[PDB]
């Protein structure tokens, strides 16, 4: 009850910044997450014994893939933490509770393969879930872990509060399907510009939380250049493995996933920052001004990929 988590001074200061890197010591990531929940939500949001048991069951259900692993989960939750802390007053007690859990859980039991490869392989998950295949699986795994004995971190919530939080988590996780991001951001663009955007309209909040989820999920592009550069290697290691598997089924993979097109990575990153990342952090900064550092950091890394193309590294 009187048991604060405290981090070493450098982490205690740096964890408050958008560009924080959680570092290579796996054994500190649970503590970092609890620290974030305590400061973001209160020390009485979850029973500590239940939270720790939940964190360790979630960790166990992430797999040893190059990118979509336990480190990604805690990284996406840290970015959500920075957004919530820099926008104190705009979020309900239930949203604060739900969204950090959503981020930790948003890629549960990921195998390193796109929804596309599941559908072309004809994986059972593609028959159970026609769209946002992995994302419906991720939510389904979250509910499973929540239903293990000793794991209901929401046990103190009322019946209707519980249903509200599981519904926040469900939409949050569905929204991490990047196929859905384009239309979601387009609608938010128009709603902001025509002045119709209304944070009391629950369907408008949903969209805004959806954009935050995309922003947190892509936050590797908002880190210090050496972090961004080295994460890109993990991202392509999965993509190229998938491309290999596409070829195994007798299919030319998209260039993104073809390891023969290694040499064109810098140009593919350009496309990605221009088509996806910059639009994402732009629209988020307009709706939530204190998230500007994510846009600024994104632009800095775009400029670093331009330098790679021009032979300056
Ligand atoms: C955080 C993050 N999240 C995602 C989902 N992605 N996807 C990419 C691939 C970008 C891309 N590469 C290519 N290739 C063309 C030939 C060589 C490369 N095309 N495209 C579009 N990068 C990222 C990042 Cl950084
Ligand atoms: Mg995902
Ligand atoms: Zn993710």
From Swiss-Prot:
Binding site for a divalent metal cation 2: 107
Residues that bind 3',5'-cyclic GMP: 68, 269
Stretches assigned to the PDEase domain: 1-312
Active site, per annotation: 68 (proton donor)
Annotated localization: Cytoplasm, Cytosol
Binding-site residues, 3',5'-cyclic AMP: 68, 269
Residues annotated for a divalent metal cation 1 binding in this entry: 72, 106-107, 217
Superkingdom of this protein's organism: Eukaryota
Tissue-by-tissue expression: Abundant in the putamen and caudate nucleus regions of brain and testis, moderately expressed in the thyroid gland, pituitary gland, thalamus and cerebellum.
Domain text: The tandem GAF domains bind cAMP, and regulate enzyme activity. The binding of cAMP stimulates enzyme activity. Composed of a C-terminal catalytic domain containing two divalent metal sites and an N-terminal regulatory domain which contains one cyclic nucleotide-binding region.
Quaternary structure (record): Homodimer.
Disease: Dyskinesia, limb and orofacial, infantile-onset: An autosomal recessive, early-onset hyperkinetic movement disorder characterized by axial hypotonia, dyskinesia of the limbs and trunk, orofacial dyskinesia, drooling, and dysarthria. The severity of the hyperkinesis is variable.
The family this protein is said to belong to: Belongs to the cyclic nucleotide phosphodiesterase family.
The protein's role, per its UniProt record: Plays a role in signal transduction by regulating the intracellular concentration of cyclic nucleotides. Can hydrolyze both cAMP and cGMP, but has higher affinity for cAMP and is more efficient with cAMP as substrate. May play a critical role in regulating cAMP and cGMP levels in the striatum, a region of the brain that contributes to the control of movement and cognition.
Name this polypeptide is given: cAMP and cAMP-inhibited cGMP 3',5'-cyclic phosphodiesterase 10A
The organism of origin for this protein: Homo sapiens
């Amino acid at each position: 009850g009187l048991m604060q988590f405290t981090l070493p001074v450098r982490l205690c200061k740096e964890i408050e910044l958008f560009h924080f890197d959680i570092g290579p010591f796996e054994n500190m990531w649970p503590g970092i997450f609890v620290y974030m929940v305590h400061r973001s939500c209160g020390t009485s949001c979850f029973e500590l014994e239940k939270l720790c048991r939940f964190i360790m069951s979630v960790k166990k259900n992430y797999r040893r893939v190059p990118y979509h692993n336990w480190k990604h989960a805690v990284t996406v939750a840290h970015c959500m933490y920075a957004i919530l802390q820099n926008n104190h007053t705009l979020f309900t007690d239930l949203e604060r509770k739900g969204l950090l859990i959503a981020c930790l859980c948003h890629d549960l039991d990921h195998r390193g393969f796109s929804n596309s490869y599941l559908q072309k392989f004809d994986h059972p998950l593609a028959a159970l879930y026609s769209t946002s295949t992995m994302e419906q699986h991720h939510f389904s795994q979250t509910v499973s872990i929540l239903q293990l004995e000793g794991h209901n971190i929401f046990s103190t919530l009322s019946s209707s509060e519980y249903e509200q939080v599981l519904e926040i988590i469900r939409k949050a996780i569905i929204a991490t399907d990047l196929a859905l991001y384009f239309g979601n951001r387009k609608q938010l663009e128009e709603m902001y510009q025509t002045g119709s955007l209304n944070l009391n309209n629950q369907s408008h909040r949903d969209r805004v939380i959806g954009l935050m989820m995309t922003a947190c999920d892509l936050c590797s592009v908002t880190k210090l250049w050496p972090v961004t550069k080295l994460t890109a290697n993990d991202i392509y290691a999965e993509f190229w493995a998938e491309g290999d598997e596409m070829k195994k089924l007798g299919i030319q993979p998209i260039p993104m996933m073809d390891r023969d097109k290694k040499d064109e990575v810098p140009q593919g990153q350009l496309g990605f920052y221009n088509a996806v990342a910059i639009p994402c952090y732009t629209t988020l900064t307009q709706i939530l001004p204190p998230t500007e550092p994510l846009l600024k950091a994104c632009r800095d890394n775009l400029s670093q990929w331009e330098k790679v193309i021009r032979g300056e590294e």
